[PDB]
Every structure is written in C-alpha cells, then in structure tokens.
UniProtKB/Swiss-Prot annotation:
UniProt GO MF annotations: 5'-3' DNA exonuclease activity; beta-lactamase activity; damaged DNA binding; zinc ion binding
Keyword Zinc: yes
Predominant cellular place of this UniProt entry's protein: nucleus
Keywords carried by this UniProt record: Cell cycle, Cell division, DNA damage, DNA repair, Hydrolase, Isopeptide bond, Metal-binding, Mitosis, Nucleus, Phosphoprotein, Ubl conjugation, Zinc, Zinc-finger
Chain's gene name: DCLRE1A
Lineage: Eukaryota, Metazoa, Chordata, Craniata, Vertebrata
Subunit structure: Binds constitutively to TP53BP1. Binds CDC27, which is itself a component of the anaphase promoting complex (APC). Binds PIAS1.
Stretch of the intact protein here: 700 to 1040 of 1040
Name of the molecule in the record: DNA cross-link repair 1A protein
Localisation: Nucleus
Organism: Homo sapiens (Human)
C-alpha cells in the first residue's frame, strides 16, 4: 500500500508510486525521473495516464515498452492543466529528464515536490520566485552536515586532467568508466572529448543514451568497442578481477587500464580534498573513486530551503528509522529559527 508522502492531498495524484498496484482514487500517476527505485512497477501492461518529462517519456516507451497512449509528456517551465489542476515541471539538476513538480491546489495551497534534486542558486530564478509554497516534499538524501563534496565542475576538471595525463604518458592505456543507471554522463563524455575518442559501450546502454536528447550524441558514442579508447562497463565490473578480464578481451591493443567509479559521498570526503585523491592500484590497473553527486550537499539543501521558506516539510528519503526522522526534524527547526520564517 502507497505511503502518505507519495500522495498529493486534494488531488487524484501520486508521485513515484508504481509498485503498489492500483492506488485507490489515483487518476494520474506522475514520474519524476527514470531511476529504478522510482519507476518500480511500470511495464507495457500499465494502463493509467503517466505524466513526466519528454526525456522520461522516451525511456518509458523504448526501455520499458509502455504504450504511447498512456504516456503524457509535458514541457518544462510551462503552466499546464492536468485533470483540472494547474501544474508546472521544473528542472531538478539530477539525471537527464529529472523534474520537480509544482501543484497549484484548487483550495489555494501550493505544493513543491522536488523528486531527486541537486539544489542550485539558479533555482531561485525559476518560476519558484513568483509565489509562496505551503508544503515542500524534500529529497533529504544527504541531510546531515557531515555530507560535503566538491562542485561537479571541480570533479570533472580532476577527471579530465587525470585521464589526459595518463594517456599522454602511455598511448597504450585504456580508460574505463563505471555506470548502472542514467545520470553522471558528463564524466565519460568529458574524458572522451579531451582524448579525441568516442565512448564505446553495449547495445543496451547505447539504446538508453539515444533516448536522452543530448546534442550531437551521434558524434560522441558508439557500439564499436575497437574504435574507442574510453569504454563503459557496468559498475559491478569496476574492480581488479573484472578489469583484468576486460583487458584480456582487447586483443593486446592496450597494456594499462585507468578506471573511474563515480560514487556519491564516501567517508574519504571527511578527510581528503579532490586535488589530493589517489587511486587503488594493482599492477597495470588503477581505480579512482570520484565523488560526483547528483544530490544536494547539506549546505546546498539548507540554502534552498532557507530561501524558499516553506510552511511545512515532508522528507522523502531516510524516512524509515526514528533516529533519521528526528535528526532531520532538528535541522529543519534550526534552519527556520536562524532565517526567521
Ligand atoms: Ni534518483
């Protein structure tokens, strides 16, 4: 049965609620983004209206085979009426296609559902600037001050400089990047661009990338692994055994692997600057963990919320333990007392 923090009161609507069967009274199911914990339950047999971005709708049709008649894509930054209620989709600065949803309830209440997001000051000049929000359903993934990490731009500067140095010292090195979902495409696209290579990958992952409206993509990716010196592999294979095995398959073209694992936060963020990051090495194989996040840091989250000044906050992440819920509630009250709302 569908939990309360996935229901929008005063509407027939649910958010990211596909794993509960037919939800009683739901007339439209919104999907914020194409990540498995959020789409869990959708397939070609789904027969209710799904509201989402254009990119999410390309993935629903091609990857999960949802029939076209039930997919309702909306443009961003545009007031739309759905089943008699005004809504707006806003860019979430998460993975490709990911949105926040503003609902303008018939009674005058305004609700923002962030989905998954990485808060940014640019959001302070979207259509959020123009009116008050009563309720915030918030992505609280990293809602604790110990969660620090660098900007995406610093992380990509590190990756590009590292890969270019390596391959210029040894033209026979291969670069490998891990993946398990959409998101974090800048990692492998930026490295391939500095090296003058396309990115090589499986047919399944090429298919997923072709749904994402990325400009000039045919110029950047390929299924011909032999023509490429940046390969994508599943995240589970990014270890010394899996990489050894891959190097065997390359027919003696290469004699060294430099590999990247984009993670979210890890506790090595509590000690080490991005500049100081070092790999794990065994023989001719080196693996770097790089903290490329598509969720808000604590500080980014706090800034957004203190700007928005919501009357009530409903967390959507870390909701399963009393200790988590109490920690989050304490920071929300600190933020409100400090800012004065
Ligand atoms: Ni996500």
């Amino acid at each position: 049965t569908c939990p309360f923090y996935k229901k929008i009161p005063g509407t027939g609507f649910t958010v990211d609620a596909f794993q509960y069967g037919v939800v009683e009274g739901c007339t439209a199911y919104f999907l914020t983004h194409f990540h498995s914990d959020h789409y869990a339950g959708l397939s070609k047999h789904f027969t209710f209206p799904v509201y989402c971005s254009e990119i999410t709708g390309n993935l629903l049709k091609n990857k999960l085979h949802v029939q076209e008649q039930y997919i309702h894509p909306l443009p961003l930054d545009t007031e739309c009426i759905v089943n008699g209620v005004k809504v707006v989709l806003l860019d979430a600065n998460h993975c490709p296609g990911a949105v926040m949803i503003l609902f303008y309830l018939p009674n005058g209440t305004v609700i923002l559902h962030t989905g998954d997001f990485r808060a940014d000051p640019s959001m302070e000049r979207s259509l959020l600037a123009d009116q008050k929000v009563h309720m915030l359903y918030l992505d609280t993934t990293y809602c604790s001050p110990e969660y620090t990490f660098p900007s995406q731009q610093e992380v990509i500067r590190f990756a590009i400089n590292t890969a270019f140095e390596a391959v210029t010292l040894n033209p026979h090195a291969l670069v490998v990047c891990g993946t398990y979902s959409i998101g974090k495409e800048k990692v492998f696209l930026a490295i391939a661009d500095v090296l003058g290579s396309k990115v090589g990958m499986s047919q399944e992952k090429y298919k997923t990338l072709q749904c994402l409206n990325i400009p000039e993509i045919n110029s950047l990716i390929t299924t011909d692994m032999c023509s490429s010196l940046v390969h994508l592999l599943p995240m589970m294979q990014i270890n010394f055994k899996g990489l050894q095995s891959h190097l065997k398959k390359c027919g003696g073209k290469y004699n060294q692997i430099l590999a990247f694992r984009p993670t979210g936060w890890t506790h090595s963020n509590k000690f080490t600057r991005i500049a100081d990051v070092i790999p794990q090495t065994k023989g001719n194989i080196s693996i770097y963990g790089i903290p490329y996040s598509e969720h808000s840091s604590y500080l980014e989250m706090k800034r957004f919320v203190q700007w928005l000044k919501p009357q009530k906050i409903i967390p959507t992440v870390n909701v399963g333990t009393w200790k988590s819920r109490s920690t989050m509630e304490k920071y929300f009250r600190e933020w409100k007392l400090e800012a004065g709302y």
